[PDB]
Write a protein that binds this ligand. Structure first.
Ligand SMILES: [Zn+2]
Ligand SMILES: [Zn+2]
Length: 91
């Protein structure tokens, strides 16, 4: 077992591909979004699945989202639990 690759890059072929439908994106429908090739059509919210543009969209961990949902989920206020915690241990 001898390899050395990790991550989405180095398109096998000699072109780009849609990170939504996984299809060969042409130079006519190539829409750059979050440093990734997206289809002017595919470009939608992974929550409601609505058409978006290079201004109303919002990506976080690779997935797209509409301002509404993006903020409705992302944005927030004072709210935390007493879960987190650390402690020493003999080593
Ligand atoms: Zn597509
Ligand atoms: Zn949405």
């Amino acid at each position: 077992g001898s390899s050395g690759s990790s991550g989405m890059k180095f398109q096998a072929p000699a072109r780009e591909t849609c990170v939504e439908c996984q299809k060969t994106v042409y130079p006519m429908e190539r829409l750059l979004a979050n440093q990734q090739v997206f289809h002017i059509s595919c470009f939608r919210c992974s929550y409601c699945n609505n058409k978006l543009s290079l201004g109303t969209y919002a990506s976080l961990h690779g997935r797209i989202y509409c301002k509404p949902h993006f903020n409705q989920l992302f944005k927030s206020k004072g709210n935390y639990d007493e879960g987190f915690g650390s402690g020493p241990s003999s080593g």
